[PDB]
Amino acid sequence: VALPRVSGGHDEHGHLEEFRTDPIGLMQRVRDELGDVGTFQLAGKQVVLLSGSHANEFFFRAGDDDLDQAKAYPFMTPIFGHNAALRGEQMKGHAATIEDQVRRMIADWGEAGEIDLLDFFAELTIYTSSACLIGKKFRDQLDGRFAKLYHELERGTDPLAYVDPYLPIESFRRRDEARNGLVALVADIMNGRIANPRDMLDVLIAVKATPRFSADEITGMFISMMFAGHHTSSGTASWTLIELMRHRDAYAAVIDELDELYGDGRSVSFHALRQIPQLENVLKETLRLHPPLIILMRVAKGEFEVQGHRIHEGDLVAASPAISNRIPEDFPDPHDFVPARYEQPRQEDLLNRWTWIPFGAGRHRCVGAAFAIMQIKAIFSVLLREYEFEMAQPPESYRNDHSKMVVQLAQPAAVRYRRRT
Ligand code: HEM
Ligand SMILES: CSCC[C@H](NC(=O)[C@H]1CC[C@@H](C)CC1)C(=O)Nc1ccncc1
């Protein structure tokens, strides 16, 4: 018995080509035509796309014995080749680290100027991530080259990886070359440390077996440590700023709140760990509209039924924060930016436990969420108190690029700044 299948997908790799150009439109059509359980074809693989509270509950409550997350991502192998840092006791230090990295990034801004949001936030979040997760010593040996290479690595996630992660296409060539470039950067750092003498890199260097670990092995470890939090935090920062500029009433409310809160004289390392309500509600609404992970994958390990539909062993099964986060029965006026949705009387995030899912839900809910929310609070506590921001292009022209499985803000994303006075 065939599962319901969405229209189209008559191209050579079925729906893959559409998934490479407009994955959100594809997923919305699955739901529009078929409901809570529908399928599309990615080359040789059927994807069973689940949506709505009932089907999402099944998806998110499944453990790795039923729905296996790791086997759904074999294409990350050419890229790769956290808990320690996410302990609550370390958060205060991380907030201070992040404040420091932001001030470093804006140190040359002067009175006024123009930035590109992807270039700015992508680079900044390389610095916050490396400093927090590997160490300040290591971060201080990084520069813009590392960020440029890391970005090429992220761009190595074209959905054609579902055909074969090793095809001779330019983005895969560039992925492999970028990884090579990172190993070289890391090798040069290790070499410098020999000649001129602690962090995680020192622990690893000291291991023996003759050194146990090569630059390639170490680079892989560091790439994997930084990956989950990099493009997600970068994009979320960009979109938080874009939504504030698009909604000047929300922006004004956030500024008033930051000024009042910081009037107690306590640092960002204090406040970024505590309530900043208007900014937090803007962040929640930003995540609902612009979830950086638009689809979540699993491989079925068994036979299941969901609303009469049978999932078979080996099936790819997916959930979509992009689609679920806009279900109109759950989120009134789902295309509208309404941070009031999260205020205490409404609490639409908390009420919709299985469909407000920018950070997932149940068994695999984001363990980086507290860090990521603190990081946004720390970044904007600095930026919005020091500078005022305006769009340098039409407000509707800021958009994501969905050509790779790793979503990124499309360029250009030009923004003006001017010192607040
Ligand atoms: C705004 C930033 C972030 C967003 C939007 C986000 C999103 C998500 C989502 C949707 C899931 C569920 C995945 C699934 O069910 O397949 C998840 C899980 C997870 N995230 Fe994040 N993430 C963010 C930042 C981070 C950071 C900074 C880290 C690490 C420092 C991280 C590490 C993880 C890990 C390890 C899981 C798996 C949890 C488990 O399997 O128990 N994420 N995240
Ligand atoms: C489909 S493009 C790759 C997306 C990427 N996924 C990954 O890095 C992981 C690979 C295998 C793991 C078991 C789980 C997911 C990622 O950035 N995931 C992520 C980010 C933030 N939190 C959780 C997962």
Author numbering: 4 to 84, 101 to 216, 223 to 234, 238 to 449
Sentences from the paper on this structure:
A potential new target for Chagas' disease chemotherapy is sterol 14α-demethylase (CYP51), a cytochrome P450 heme thiolate-containing enzyme which is involved in biosynthesis of membrane sterols in all biological kingdoms from bacteria to animals. Azoles block CYP51 activity, resulting in decline of the normal complement of endogenous sterols and accumulation of various 14α-methyl sterols with cytostatic or cytoxic consequences.
In the CYP51Mt-compound 9 complex, the methylcyclohexane moiety protruded toward bulk solvent, while the methylsulfanyl group loosely bound in the species-specific cavity in two alternative conformations. The side chain of M433 also adopted two alternative conformations. Although racemic mixtures were used for co-crystallization, only one enantiomer of each compound was found in the active site. Compound 9 bound both CYP51Tc and CYP51Tb with the same affinity.
